[PDB]
Design a binder for this molecule. Structure first.
Ligand SMILES: [K+]
Ligand SMILES: [K+]
Ligand SMILES: [K+]
Ligand SMILES: [Mg+2]
Ligand SMILES: [Mg+2]
Ligand SMILES: [Mg+2]
Ligand SMILES: [Mg+2]
Ligand code: NA
Lengths: 272, 98, 95, 89, 27, 51
RNA sequence: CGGGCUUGAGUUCAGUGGCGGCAGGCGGAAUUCGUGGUGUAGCGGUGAAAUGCAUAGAUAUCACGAGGAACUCCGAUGCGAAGGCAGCUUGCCAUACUGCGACUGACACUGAAGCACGAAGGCGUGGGUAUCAAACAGGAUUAGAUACCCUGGUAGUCCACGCAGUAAACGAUGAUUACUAGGAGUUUGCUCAAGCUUCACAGCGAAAGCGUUAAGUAAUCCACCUGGGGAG
RNA sequence: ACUAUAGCUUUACAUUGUAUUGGAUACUAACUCGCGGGCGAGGACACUGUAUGGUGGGUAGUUU
RNA sequence: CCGGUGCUGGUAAAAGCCCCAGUAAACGGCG
RNA sequence: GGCUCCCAA
């Protein structure tokens, strides 16, 4: 759900934000949060390697459980919670042993539900199973790439993948980008799609909101001088020629995947 | 409160004991929701008119029963969560058919 | 022995070899005629009999010359063991 | 609605003289109100059941006609039945 | 059912529908 | 009521290729033909008759 | 105005339905693309051709993988206020017809304003995108071809929510009630009553024609017309 | 504009081995990655060194 | 508008190049 | 200050 702001201000006329309807708690679990220090896009030499990063609201880091190791121990959903670090919401789980954890909240998960992990776990929403136990055709997220490493694949708000066929020790999965690829049957995934699918409908409305989110203004290359950018220069407006970066990397069709990568043997169809 | 009959087909790749255990699990899932079983019969291992998922043969079984008009969705969810059933259908019998 | 016919052309494929009215020489208003189909059948059968294989028919399309092609294939070399029709649309795509 | 024979008999027994009072005012009113409530709860979930919506409008008109007949007959029964069921809104 | 009755109605609809298109995107 | 079971009886109302015979070719009544057609399609969905 | 009656109207009960509405699941044929076997001089299209695909490897043919749309035979009949409704199944609704020796007692008809629904095409946001296909591009025929024919092809066609409110939205025939002749079929409920369509008395009509489903005989209310253009 | 050149990229040799009907397949033991404090996934490829052919105003020295 | 320029494809002891196909909210052109 | 509200948490 989203909320549109009435046009009492020019900076509010085009603002659309979320309704925060699924959030049930206002403060985070203390044992699972730590203060976060911001980079301005600078690496360990102090030189800025990534542009347009800096400022924004102070944030705390929530430790998200992407491994789901406690197999067979049931957990109960305590609260649905806001996370400043990612687009999706998180869910606080209490285990029967007194452990507490955070997971990425799937769509349709409510307070009071029970989740499990492992081969014995039922293929319902919020359960984390090896892909060899997931019946063909269901909607999954938080997909592992190597057994035991942790979820890497389907994590953003609203995104989902589908398990379409299994071929021996591998399964065929269609990815959010449209790629079709093989994943080992030992890898884990969580049933359901990621919640908060209305994230893409939000509109900032003003430059200040990007400043709050921690982004700095971006300058086009055509309005620089030739000493700063290949596309710069000229008197009056000029098109800049073929679009390219500061180092001259073409920006309108040149592929940059390494064309000898071993992971190509596990890709069936390509869409990126 | 209604009379139903469910006819399903089991994969021939499964064993006889596996098929019996699957049928028992289906009957137990039906009884968990709350129902009586009028009859359960096994047409047996027989060929099909057309190939079903590359095998042209399967095990035909059916069960006639009485249940509340709410366990059908649970039966369908179990049928989809079990990947050893290749075809299923469910019918309601009126007073003339029953 | 698959015979793919239509309102415009008739082609035959045995598998190994193939033939068609356009390959035989007929171009327009003659490919869908009894002469061209039998000529193409003879052209394919000249290599069919000289192949070591002696078959079922899989006529697919409707056209004038399927009977002539089947008769020529039966007469030259091997004989038509069975003409099983495979002509194939249960309310499919809009034409 | 559920509209069971037991529910109809209980409604008739509560509203009107004896169970057999199936076709009198203050009982047709109760039956129509029950059906209207159940149809509203059904249309809350099925927002495209326009036939059910039209049937609900017809039921509302029928209840209005019965209430108008009660108006023509007297006012005490009118006041009693509307106070009991809850009508004016 | 003469036929010529509907020809006049068809013809004036064409003039009306064409006259509006000349200034549709014309601000 | 005609059961979809025992499709040998159902084959009496079918043609050589398996299609359903028209009512004017076998007599019958409208209700009987509708029941037969319903029973045929239930068998097709249960792999008891070719499509 | 004050009482009564049950025939009209409505409620209940039983029987009989149904391409009636909404929602969730399941399907085979055809067809599209991608990746691999066989194989090579054409394929496609037309009145005749050409534009197009094809030896840096087509049509055809055998497989595996990923998808979208439509429901052959039954099938002409039935349902819905109308628009409309057709693969199989289930759930939740609505509704109709027939009767009861059950109930209430004129509670009825119509309806200016208003409200609701309302084919196709069209608009906005998000999905999806196989076929067909406005606009557009090329090839033909013609004096010309801004068309008819052929090859491509984007919106659209599909789904969800929201606008829009139009049609040869037609039976070119508003709703309700009562009465008045025969033939030929058909469906359901059992010789009878509902419904469904064409010949046809009286009568009506300018005529074609309508004729128990009236455009006949009568009563109640609503809508609309007053020569053709201009002009919806 | 002339001449070079970082980077990217092609092949050969080295790292680098074994079998079967050569250039394909297969194997695991070199080599790489993940998990836990051996197991799993790859695999003679990838990576890197030497040589070689392309590309290279990204950079440099100059000429005009 | 894909003609041109870019871009995506199909010698030491094979890349390229050619050719053909696509791309203009790519640079660019619309006498 | 508790407290209320809000999202940039
Ligand atoms: K900018
Ligand atoms: K420069
Ligand atoms: K007549
Ligand atoms: Mg400047
Ligand atoms: Mg200038
Ligand atoms: Mg320089
Ligand atoms: Mg110097
Ligand atoms: Na210029």
């Amino acid at each position: 759900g989203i909320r549109k702001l009435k046009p009492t201000t020019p900076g509010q006329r085009h603002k659309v934000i979320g309704a925060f309807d699924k959030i049930t708690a206002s403060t985070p679990e203390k044992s699972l949060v730590v203060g976060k220090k911001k980079t301005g896009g600078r690496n360990n030499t102090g030189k800025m390697t990534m542009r347009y990063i800096g400022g924004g609201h102070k944030q705390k880091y929530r430790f998200i459980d992407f491994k789901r190791t406690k197999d067979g121990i049931p957990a109960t959903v305590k609260t649905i919670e806001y996370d400043p670090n990612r687009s999706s919401r998180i869910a606080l789980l209490y285990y029967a042993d007194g452990a507490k954890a955070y997971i990425i909240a799937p769509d349709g998960l409510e307070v009071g539900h029970t989740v499990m992990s492992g081969s014995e776990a039922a293929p319902e929403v919020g359960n984390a199973l090896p892909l060899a136990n997931i019946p063909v055709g269901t909607i999954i997220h938080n997909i592992e790439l190597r057994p035991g490493q942790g979820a890497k694949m389907v994590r953003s708000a609203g995104s989902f993948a589908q398990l379409t066929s299994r071929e021996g020790t591998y399964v065929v999965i269609k990815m959010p980008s449209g790629e079709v690829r093989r994943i080992l049957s030992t890898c884990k995934a969580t049933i359901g799609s990621v919640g908060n699918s209305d994230h893409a409908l939000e509109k900032s409305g003003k430059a200040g909101r990007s400043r709050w989110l921690g982004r700095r203004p971006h300058n086009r290359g055509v309005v620089m001088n030739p000493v700063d950018h290949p596309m710069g220069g000229g008197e009056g407006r000029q098109s800049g020629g073929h679009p390219r970066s500061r180092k001259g990397l073409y920006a309108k069709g040149l592929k940059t995947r390494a064309p000898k990568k071993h992971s190509s043997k596990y890709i069936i169809e390509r869409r990126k | 409160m209604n009379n139903y009959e469910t006819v399903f087909i089991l994969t021939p790749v499964l064993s006889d004991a596996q098929m019996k255990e699957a049928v028992d699990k289906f009957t137990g899932l039906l009884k968990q929701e709350g129902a009586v079983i009028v009859n359960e019969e096994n047409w047996g291992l027989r060929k099909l008119a057309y190939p079903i998922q590359k095998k042209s043969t399967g095990f035909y079984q059916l069960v006639e029963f009485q249940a509340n008009p709410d366990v059908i969705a649970k039966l369908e969810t179990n049928f989809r969560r079990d990947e050893r059933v290749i075809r299923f259908l469910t019918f309601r019998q009126d007073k003339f058919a029953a | 022995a698959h015979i793919h016919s239509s309102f415009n052309n008739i082609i035959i494929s045995l598998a190994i070899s193939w033939s068609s009215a356009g390959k035989m020489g007929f171009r327009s208003s003659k490919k869908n005629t009894p002469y061209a189909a039998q000529m193409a059948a003879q052209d394919c059968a000249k290599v069919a009999y000289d192949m070591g294989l002696r078959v079922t028919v899989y006529v697919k399309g409707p056209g004038n010359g399927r009977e002539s092609a089947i008769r020529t294939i039966h007469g030259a070399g091997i004989e038509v063991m069975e003409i099983i029709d495979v002509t194939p649309p249960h309310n499919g795509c809009r034409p | 609605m559920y509209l069971d024979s037991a529910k109809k008999a209980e409604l008739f027994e509560k509203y009107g003289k004896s169970v057999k009072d199936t076709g009198s005012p203050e009982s047709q009113i109760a039956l129509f109100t029950f059906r209207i409530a159940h149809l509203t709860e059904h249309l809350r979930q099925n927002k495209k059941d326009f036939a059910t919506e039209r049937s609900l409008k017809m039921l509302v008109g029928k209840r209005r006609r019965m209430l108008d007949y009660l108006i023509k007959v007297d006012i005490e029964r009118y006041r009693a039945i509307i106070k009991e069921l809850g009508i004016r809104r | 059912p003469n036929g010529k009755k509907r020809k006049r109605h068809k013809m004036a609809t064409h003039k009306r529908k064409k006259r509006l298109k000349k200034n549709r995107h014309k601000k | 009521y005609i059961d979809y079971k025992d499709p040998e009886f159902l084959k009496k109302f079918l043609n050589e290729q398996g299609k359903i015979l028209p009512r004017r070719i076998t007599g019958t009544s409208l209700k009987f033909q509708r029941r037969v057609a319903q029973a045929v399609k239930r068998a097709r969905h249960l792999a008891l008759l070719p499509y």
